[PDB]
Design a protein around this ligand. Structure first.
Ligand SMILES: [Zn+2]
Lengths: 300, 301, 260, 107, 60
């Protein structure tokens, strides 16, 4: 409660240190006759510091909040609910004017979600809403953290709709980061897979030098989601029910990436070899020889 | 006197009044949660003898920012899904910018123009004032105004015509807020429908006829040749006014750390609860003055 | 590996041409062979060949013999020519949104899949992950539009197909997609707990299916229940008016109205 | 030149394949030509198959990717019992152009 | 009877007691249970039914 930001910053650093040194020790509340672990009390004190007037103290508070993982589950859940003075700590710490505190909060959410998958489920919507933030480094860090917590989660329909509606990226670094995120991502809806295919082909026709990383991207995307690609397979191959369709241009990168996706999905899915057309089998035999690092061996 | 940052509207300020050791801080109106175009209020450890705060919202936190925007856009999509029109009124200088940009970004998906019925001269003046006073705006805009001009809205309409047009998805932004008089009441009195005539109130509507009855059914009114509405017709009072809630007020009081607190710009039922909360929590005196009541405090200079 | 039978199958398929009098006779011969041998290597290869032939000639008049009850070849790399059509009407029935013009086609697809489950459960069993994945797109949606869009029709159809597919749906190989379907059901139970009385028929069907599941294969059902015991307990606390919900939860005591 | 590979006339296709084999030095790693060779190798017209063998020889001499992509197919045609002995003789010299990589040469 | 928390509590106590007996010597607990079932017949025997539900073999 000092009137100088440096004292508060050093004090929150020291309180983080002492909480990490004695987490399970019991500290009594002055007014209430409640026995509380020291780490939870320090969690509350640091959470209160995320509302500090100075932004450097807020950055420090968010970083140390990330660094602690011995806190109880309900205390972890409290910082995301609207309404132990730790209520809405990350909510206020994720929508500040300063971008640096937002980056610190994003990284803190990454560490906390990696420690707690149950926390990650709650953090999914908050972190994917952050993708709309228009500071470049903020969105790169959000991409990296989302990729980091990807193993413990699976995206929802509306959250995926949200991230897709603001997925229009221009620069190379953000695009490559999105490609890696989509390599590691987990989704629950095939409509999101369709929208991802649409955006990736737009980014295929828009950026030729992105072809490599989008081919690899779709190679990893289908290997993970074979079940969601199976309805979308006749949606994409343009297989007419009762007509032999024209043989698509084997040099068209968009089409070649649609086959890469559908063949990486087919690896896990017996039912995919059935819905292949004749030219689909012909094209498969070629890209298995020519692009064996993208196309996997199948059981036709 | 010293002016601080309030965050209510562009140029809103908290005015400290320091003479000798005695000092009084008047926050006027403020918002401790930053908007999409305005920052959060801040004041140093002034520790004054008295701190006069607004209390129009002594209610709990209004479910963050993303949830409110999501609910507002979901209601807008529900109203326009059946082809209904929307008739939100606003003062055209406060939360109008945030609602405008939010609805524009929502319309990036379908890309159909939305009519802004605040006067084209007034709209141009608002854009110009917001671009001349970039330092008063958010760091979000202060860092990204060079890259792009967010105030350059691609959707706008002039005035009377599209209001009496066919029942489409058009959402009107009336020039006078609070539904007290003007274009807002003129449009509202001529509009009805289940999906159409969606009236979303971001303001507070302190005592003006028609507008104030958001907590009521909004189907009674008091006027000559009054109309009736239906349940599907939006009478939702979205919490989009740039006012600090109870958590924000406690945050401000703890931030300033005053010797005493005084409450204005609110309702008595909310203000008595806020006073009880302040006295029970921070062990600091609070006051409940009525119009014409004189509140006197002692000083120890 | 089993790929040799797959590689020699086109020769057999070409030789048999399209006469069912030869396919039926060789299926009968294979059935007699496996009855003589059983689980031995010769009998196992005979079962694999019979399964491949049935998959590539699903017009057999002896579908799912007693031998194919134990067969785990549904997950194997064998191919069947019904995959395209079952995929077709699985998506024709999947979309049960506010577009009510498709309701008649959804009902036709549902009753046809019911007939298929009655007749050829094994063929529909290989496509179980497809319908399991298709259920994930409706649970997270809000209660109001879920009621309005009648998306519960697809869930009820899938649950009825599950009820018709048992005990074949309770085999060890078809467990991931079964768990996914049940997870989707309990998820939509949790989400729409404000007013769950509209799901009365769905709740009764779900309770009956879980009863049959814990009866046919108790350890698998117990493992699934332990996997998601906390969501079920939370549903029971929030929705305490569902007596069958609590009664089903009381069925863990074992080791881990209709009349004419 | 390449537009004639789509003709239904197998003689025209054979002449086009022979031209592509003759032009192999200025168009290696041309994917459409590679796919044309691969598709004409399993043709049912003997003149087209011979032209595809000649073009495959030239393109394996020129480009490494075609060689690695074709070595398995050439192997399966040579060892395939349905291939006549004369076509087997015609196919074996393709393997002399598998020197682009140590593992390819060993195979 | 689980509406009354005491009964559930006692059955939990019996899970602990029967596990302890299984650890040491599970012989006389079933004999005492049957003796009480005979003496306190027929109203207490639902406990024996639940116990048999937990352990089908020995109890049946
Ligand atoms: Zn004001």
């Amino acid at each position: 409660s000092d009137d100088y930001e440096q004292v508060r910053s050093a004090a929150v650093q020291l309180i983080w240190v002492v909480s990490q040194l004695y987490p399970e020790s019991i500290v009594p509340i002055p007014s209430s006759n409640e026995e509380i672990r020291l780490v939870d009390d320090a969690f509350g004190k640091i959470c209160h510091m995320v509302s500090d007037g100075s932004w450097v103290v807020r950055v420090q508070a968010a970083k140390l909040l990330g660094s602690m993982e011995q806190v109880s589950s309900h205390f972890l859940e409290q910082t995301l609910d609207k309404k132990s003075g730790a209520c809405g700590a990350f909510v206020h710490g994720l929508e500040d004017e300063m971008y640096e505190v937002r980056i610190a909060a994003v990284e803190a959410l990454c560490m906390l979600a990696q420690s707690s998958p149950s926390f990650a489920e709650k953090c999914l919507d908050f972190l994917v809403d952050m993708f709309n933030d228009e500071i470049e480094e903020v969105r790169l860090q959000s991409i990296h953290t989302m990729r980091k917590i990807s193993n413990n989660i699976t995206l929802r329909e509306d959250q995926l709709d949200t991230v897709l509606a603001v997925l229009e990226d221009s620069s190379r670094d953000i695009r490559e980061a999105l490609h890696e995120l989509l390599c590691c991502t987990n989704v629950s809806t095939k409509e999101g897979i369709h929208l991802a295919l649409v955006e990736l082909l737009k980014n295929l026709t828009k950026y030729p030098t992105d072809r490599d990383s989008i081919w690899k991207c779709l190679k990893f995307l289908g290997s993970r989601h074979p079940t969601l690609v199976l309805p979308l397979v006749p949606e994409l191959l343009s297989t007419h029910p009762f007509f032999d369709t024209a043989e698509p241009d084997m040099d068209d990168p968009a089409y070649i990436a649609v086959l890469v996706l559908i063949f990486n999905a087919a690896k896990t899915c017996p039912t995919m070899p059935a819905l292949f057309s004749d030219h689909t089998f012909r094209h498969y035999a070629y890209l298995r020889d020519s692009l064996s690092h993208l196309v996997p061996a199948l059981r036709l | 006197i010293k002016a601080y940052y309030a965050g209510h509207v562009l140029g809103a300020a908290m005015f400290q009044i320091k003479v000798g050791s005695e000092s009084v801080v008047y926050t006027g109106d403020y918002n401790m949660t930053p908007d999409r175009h305005l920052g959060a209020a801040w004041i140093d450890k002034c520790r004054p003898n008295l701190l006069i705060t607004q209390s129009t919202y002594a209610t709990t936190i209004r479910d963050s920012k993303r949830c409110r925007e999501r609910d507002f856009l979901k209601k807008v999509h529900e109203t326009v899904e059946r082809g209904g029109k929307v008739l939100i009124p606003v003062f055209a200088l406060g939360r109008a910018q945030e609602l405008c940009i939010l609805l524009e970004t929502f319309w990036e998906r379908m890309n159909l123009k939305v009519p802004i019925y605040f006067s084209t001269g007034l709209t141009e003046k608002a854009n110009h004032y917001y671009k001349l006073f970039i330092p008063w705006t958010n760091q979000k805009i202060r860092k990204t105004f060079v890259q792009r001009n967010m105030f350059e809205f691609k959707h706008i309409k002039a005035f009377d015509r599209a209001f009496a047009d066919n029942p489409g998805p058009m959402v009107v932004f009336a020039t006078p807020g609070m539904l007290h008089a003007g274009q807002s009441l003129q449009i509202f009195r001529k509009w009805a429908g289940n999906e159409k005539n969606m009236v979303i109130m971001p303001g507070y509507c302190v005592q003006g006829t028609v507008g104030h009855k958001i907590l009521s059914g909004q189907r009674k009114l008091e006027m000559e040749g009054r109309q009736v509405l239906e349940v599907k017709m939006q009478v939702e009072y979205m919490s989009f006014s740039a006012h600090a809630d109870a958590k924000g007020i406690m945050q401000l009081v703890g931030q300033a750390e005053p010797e005493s607190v005084l409450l204005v710009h609110g309702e008595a039922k909310k203000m008595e609860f806020l006073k009880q909360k302040i006295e029970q929590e921070l062990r600091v005196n609070c006051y409940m003055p009525a119009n014409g009541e004189t509140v006197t405090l002692p000083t120890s200079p | 590996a089993c790929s040799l039978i797959q590689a020699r199958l086109p020769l057999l398929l070409s030789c048999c041409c399209g006469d069912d009098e030869s396919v039926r006779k060789v299926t009968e011969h294979l059935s007699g062979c496996i009855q003589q041998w059983g689980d031995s290597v010769l009998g196992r290869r005979c079962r694999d060949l019979l399964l491949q032939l049935y998959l590539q000639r699903p017009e057999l008049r002896v579908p799912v013999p007693e031998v194919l009850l134990h067969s785990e070849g549904a997950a194997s790399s064998s191919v069947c020519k019904l995959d395209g059509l079952i995929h077709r009407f699985i998506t024709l029935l999947a979309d049960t949104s506010d577009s009510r013009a498709l309701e008649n086609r959804g009902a036709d697809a549902s009753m046809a899949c019911r007939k298929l489950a009655v007749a050829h459960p094994l063929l529909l069993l290989r496509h179980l992950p497809m319908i399991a994945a298709l259920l994930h797109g409706r649970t997270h949606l809000n209660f109001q539009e879920f009621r309005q869009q009648n998306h519960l029709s697809c869930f009820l159809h899938v649950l009825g197909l599950l009820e018709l597919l048992q005990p074949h749906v309770f085999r060890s190989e078809h467990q991931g997609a079964l768990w996914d379907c049940l997870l989707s059901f309990i998820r939509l139970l949790l989400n729409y707990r404000k007013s769950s009385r509209h799901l009365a028929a769905f709740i009764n069907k779900f309770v009956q299916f879980i009863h049959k599941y814990i009866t046919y294969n108790a350890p698998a059902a117990i493992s699934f229940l332990q996997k998601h015991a906390d969501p079920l307990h939370d549903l029971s606390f929030d929705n305490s008016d569902l007596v069958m919900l609590k009664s089903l939860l009381a069925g863990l005591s074992l080791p881990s109205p209709l009349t004419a | 030149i390449f537009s004639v590979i789509h003709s239904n006339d197998p003689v025209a296709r054979a002449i086009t394949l022979r031209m592509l084999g003759s032009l192999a030095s200025i168009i290696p790693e041309r994917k459409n030509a590679h796919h044309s060779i691969r598709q004409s190798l399993d043709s049912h017209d003997n003149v087209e198959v011979e032209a595809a063998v000649f073009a495959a020889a030239n393109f394996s001499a020129q480009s490494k990717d075609f060689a690695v992509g074709i070595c398995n197919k050439i192997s399966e045609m040579i060892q395939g019992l349905a291939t006549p002995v004369d076509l087997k003789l015609k196919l074996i010299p393709i393997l002399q152009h598998m020197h682009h990589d140590a593992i390819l040469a060993s195979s | 009877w689980m509406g009354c928390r005491a009964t559930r509590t006692l059955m939990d106590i019996y899970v602990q007691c029967l596990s302890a007996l299984i650890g040491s010597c599970p012989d006389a607990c079933v004999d005492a249970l049957l003796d009480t079932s005979v003496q306190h017949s027929p109203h207490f025997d639902w406990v024996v039914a639940h116990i048999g539900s937990s352990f089908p073999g020995t109890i049946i």
